Design a protein around this ligand. Sequence first.
Ligand SMILES: CNc1ncnc2c1ncn2C1CC1
Length: 164
Amino acid sequence: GTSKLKYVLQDARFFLIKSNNHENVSLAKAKGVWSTLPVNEKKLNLAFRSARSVILIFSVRESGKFQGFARLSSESHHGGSPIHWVLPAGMSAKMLGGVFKIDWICRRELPFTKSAHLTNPWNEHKPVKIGRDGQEIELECGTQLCLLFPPDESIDLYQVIHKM
Ligand SMILES: CNc1ncnc2c1ncn2C1CC1
């Protein structure tokens, strides 16, 4: 069903995450972590304190799809085992130093063709697939986007709910 999912998404905030490569999203799915550039790191830390759920919706550049979505379980922290991110040209390891812990809600993909009816008011009403890394997605659009993903039967949102 969709009732626990809707409960998790109630009054949530949503952010588009754009990865330049598949490798880093695969690592994030395996290890439950994400890192972003300092500008977005500060925004996500502010949002984590402001809302009961902050949802990251991932899309790999040139894939034509979203690869899933996850909820922040923590603000960024430094000083763990260095995650072996594949580094885009011009991006340093220090730039990705802040590590957020995340709980995946759906690890399944959604092609952009399925979200063509959803526009984001916080990005000039452009289709929700359009946006830079860190673009906030307004509540209604983000909720409807998350509800379009195929159900991920491998995830139990009970423990996710128990973190809110
Ligand atoms: C581990 N984090 C990341 N991996 C790959 N690309 C990323 C990224 N964060 C932002 N980007 C885009 C270049 C803007």
